[PDB]
Design a protein around this ligand. Structure first.
Ligand SMILES: CC[C@H](C)[C@H](NC(=O)[C@H]1CCCCN1C)C(=O)N(CCCCC(C)C)[C@H](C[C@@H](O)c1nc(C(=O)N[C@@H](Cc2ccc(F)cc2)C[C@H](C)C(=O)O)cs1)C(C)C
Ligand SMILES: Nc1nc2c(ncn2[C@@H]2O[C@H](COP(=O)(O)OP(=O)(O)O)[C@@H](O)[C@H]2O)c(=O)[nH]1
Ligand SMILES: [Mg+2]
Lengths: 68, 428
């Protein structure tokens, strides 16, 4: 029974070390994915707002040519 | 031939073990190459107890040197008596154990232990009539405490009907400042209660105080400590190494010293106490040896013998002296101090005399007591242990090798039970 317990201890040590590596790897994967999509969302909104300025700037130039 | 197989594990184990072999080799006239150069046939009658005999009339210690780092065993190999040991009996890893019982017992020590057992198996199979095993180690470190107790457990599985003997060095804050030693000691004591027949409690607290107070060494070294350990080790094995009447083997010693299986922890003593070099020119008289060997100041376990009662005692006198006078002085001690010897074990003090004294002395005496006062040593460890363990302090070094807190609770329990068991018989 003492030999089975010695085995169980060394397996627990290996398993906890492996679980720590695993969670570090998952937590880091979800952080970097979350950051990428957040940053792309912020630049998309920046340029989609700058493109609304281009639509408005052509409405101003076409409104001029509707005073002819 | 009644062969004893010796194992030494970890720094302390290998250091006091190395010194043991130096001392007894000199007592048996064996030199560093293994050649006999003595002037007495008493030296060789029971040489096979500790030495194998090879061709060329060579004597090799039946000794296995174990450690998880190489430092201490390179020190032993390179030392003066280092060439005596069988080279394949040096079994060592590279990792070390980091003063961690879990590493020694469960992870780092597990990887090396089957190659130790292969050497133990080889030495055992070669024995005509094996008595059993003696291990030297500390309980405060990692390898000796953790791996050493792992070895005890494996040896017991292979050889369930042989005697297991230890010289276990107990940690003291006067010698070491590693915070986790009470953890390692309590875990190791849990093992010793279950799996040893006889344990000599060599307490570093006592060894330090003897060196400081009595021997007047203001800055003791490990060497100063070990000089008292080797004297004691020479002393308590005299009956096993020379002819031939009382406690002549390990089982007979155990049947005399161990009235209950769990209470097998002994409190050794020695007279005269000496430091290295500093010369004893005056031999002690039989009355002084007897007064001094029973003195608290001469015990290698830091326990007050007046605070308990002696269950059993072995006294072993060395040198040429009057057997009549030894008998008178021994009877005198137990008659003048009769209340410290339990009435319910009649005639519980046994006495041996060997004619050959140790190196540099004409007269010596060695005391081996199974006293209930030894609870004070375990109680000291328990208090140091509980202080940390009640806040689970430093426990991550152990749970990170896969241990659970429950192991600590069990070991804490078994040792506190040992203490209360000693108090039970102190009040009967
Ligand atoms: C400056 C630290 C000194 C060295 C240390 N003092 C302490 O630890 C104090 C300081 C603060 C609070 C209380 N503690 C105990 C001390 O005096 N030690 C033990 C700690 C050493 C651990 C680390 C620093 C290496 C003494 C032992 C120390 O002086 C040493 N002795 C030896 C020694 O015995 N070397 C021999 C060889 C040997 C090497 C290693 C061994 F394990 C054994 C023998 C050869 C010498 C010439 C001899 O035979 O006297 C090596 S180191 C104890 C008896 C208290
Ligand atoms: N008496 C004595 N104690 C020692 C010696 N070396 C280490 N110790 C003690 O042993 C404990 C540490 O154990 P150690 O044997 O060094 O660790 P290991 O190498 O993992 O077994 C501490 O309490 C030290 O004070 C020694 O040579 N003599
Ligand atoms: Mg060490």
């Amino acid at each position: 029974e003492k030999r089975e317990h010695e085995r169980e201890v060394i397996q627990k040590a290996i398993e906890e070390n492996n679980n720590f590596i695993k969670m570090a790897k998952e937590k880091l994967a979800q952080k970097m994915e979350s950051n990428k999509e957040n940053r792309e969302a912020h630049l998309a909104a920046m340029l989609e707002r700058l493109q609304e300025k281009d639509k408005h700037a052509e409405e101003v130039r076409k409104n001029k040519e509707l005073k002819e | 031939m009644r062969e004893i197989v010796h194992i030494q594990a970890g720094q302390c184990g290998n250091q006091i073990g190395a010194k043991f072999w130096e001392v007894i080799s000199d007592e048996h006239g064996i030199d560093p190459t293994g050649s006999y150069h003595g002037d007495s046939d008493l030296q060789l009658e029971r040489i096979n107890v500790y030495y194998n005999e090879a061709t060329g009339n060579k004597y090799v210690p039946r000794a296995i040197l174990v450690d998880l780092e190489p430092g201490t065993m390179d020190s032993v190999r390179s030392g003066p008596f280092g060439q005596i040991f069988r080279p394949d009996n040096f079994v060592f890893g590279q990792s070390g154990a980091g003063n961690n019982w879990a590493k020694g017992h469960y992870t780092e020590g597990a990887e090396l232990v089957d190659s130790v057992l292969d050497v133990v198996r080889k030495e055992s199979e070669s024995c005509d009539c094996l008595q059993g095993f003696q291990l030297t180690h500390s309980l405060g470190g990692g390898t000796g405490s953790g791996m050493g107790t792992l070895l005890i457990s494996k040896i017991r599985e292979e050889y369930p009907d042989r005697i297991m003997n230890t010289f276990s060095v107990m940690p003291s804050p006067k010698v070491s400042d590693t915070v986790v030693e009470p953890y390692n000691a309590t875990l190791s004591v849990h093992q010793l209660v279950e799996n040893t027949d006889e344990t000599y409690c060599i307490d570093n607290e006592a060894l330090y105080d003897i060196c400081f107070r009595t021997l007047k060494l203001t800055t003791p070294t490990y060497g100063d400590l070990n000089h008292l350990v080797s004297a004691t080790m020479s002393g308590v094995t005299t009956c096993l190494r020379f002819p031939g009447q009382l406690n002549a083997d390990l089982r007979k010693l155990a049947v005399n010293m161990v009235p209950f299986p769990r209470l097998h922890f002994f409190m050794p003593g020695f007279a005269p106490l000496t430091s290295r070099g500093s010369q004893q020119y005056r031999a002690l008289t039989v009355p002084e040896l007897t007064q001094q060997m029973f003195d608290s100041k001469n015990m290698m376990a830091a326990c007050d013998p007046r605070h308990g009662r002696y269950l059993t005692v072995a006294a072993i006198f060395r040198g040429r002296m009057s057997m009549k006078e030894v008998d008178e002085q021994m009877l005198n001690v137990q008659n003048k101090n009769s209340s410290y010897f339990v009435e319910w074990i009649p005639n519980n003090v046994k006495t041996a005399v060997c004619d050959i004294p140790p190196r540099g002395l004409k007269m010596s005496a060695t005391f081996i007591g199974n006293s209930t006062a030894i609870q004070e040593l375990f109680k000291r460890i328990s208090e140091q242990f509980t202080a940390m363990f009640r806040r689970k302090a430093f426990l991550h070094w152990y749970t990170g090798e896969g241990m659970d807190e429950m192991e600590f609770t069990e070991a804490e329990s078994n040792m506190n039970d040992l203490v209360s068991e000693y108090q039970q018989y102190q009040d009967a």
